[PDB]
Design a protein around this ligand. Structure first.
Ligand SMILES: [Zn+2]
Ligand SMILES: [Zn+2]
Lengths: 171, 171
């Protein structure tokens, strides 16, 4: 079931999210959240979504879109559950992108993030991962983890002159 | 008659505005602009408005609101036509304010501008002024001149964490 997606300005979006325990991810409540989160993301036509966006301060993130309307060019992103992620840049190289955020409706801003990263995380079944990610997903993952730390993409804007409303940016 | 108010993202809003000549302000076209600008500002329930906002790169600004709904607290601002303004801070002191902009719909951001300034300008009849301004008007005037230089308030944001959507900020 779709849940409300908090908008920038709501203090929750700037608070820190706490890690999920290995027990908790078994709870019937956790499973309902992952369900609602996905349900919420697909409905919003999103690429990713962090728990804080729907009001929960837990280190939980879901991704996956394929043929996403909001971001035409972008390659598919398989559905995965990302828990307690910890990221580290592996390069200073960046691939600028006009990011958008479901908590920042109708806008887009240019952001340069490292295009190669190391991500450590645990999935819905408690499986541990530590892989180096690159490309579009590296951007999505970084964007999603920021949420777990109360950071939004507008905080990483490269130039406020490269920021605005969608319909307008698209000219 | 109300004219379209360009939204952030439209390149016009980042271009430089040129000064108005003493002849031009006599033209029947200039007079129509001041009329439309006022008509546009009152309809938008604005406090000020610069020509570039409606698509004209001329150093033209109009102010005046009285009992403005969008900004409750604010004191009245008498209607005046500000042409070719040139501002200079007279203090380092600031009076933070949650500014908004008709070219940046539905949002508000915290901005700290000097609360005392020197403004030199010419009115619709060609009268020259050079007065020191303070208080709310100092903020409005500074905000409006930035427009004439392609600057929006989001460029002067104090903290991206102190920025967001109205309905949300108002909690
Ligand atoms: Zn987001
Ligand atoms: Zn403005």
């Amino acid at each position: 079931s779709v849940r409300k997606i908090l908008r920038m300005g709501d203090p929750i979006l700037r608070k820190i999210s706490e890690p999920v325990t290995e027990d908790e991810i078994q709870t019937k409540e956790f499973k309902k959240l992952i369900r609602d989160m996905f349900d919420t993301m697909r409905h919003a036509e999103g690429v990713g979504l962090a728990a804080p966006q729907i009001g929960i301060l837990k280190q939980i993130v879901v991704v996956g879109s394929e043929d996403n309307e909001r971001y035409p060019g972008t390659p598919d992103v398989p559905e995965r559950i990302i828990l307690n992620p910890v990221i580290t840049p592996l390069t200073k190289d960046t691939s600028g992108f006009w990011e958008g955020c479901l908590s920042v409706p109708g806008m887009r801003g240019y952001v340069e993030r490292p295009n190669q990263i190391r991500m450590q995380w645990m999935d819905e079944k408690g499986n541990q991962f530590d892989e180096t990610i690159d490309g579009y997903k590296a951007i999505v993952y970084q964007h999603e983890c920021d949420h777990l730390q109360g950071i939004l993409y507008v905080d990483r804007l490269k130039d406020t002159k490269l920021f605005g409303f969608n319909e307008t940016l698209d000219s």
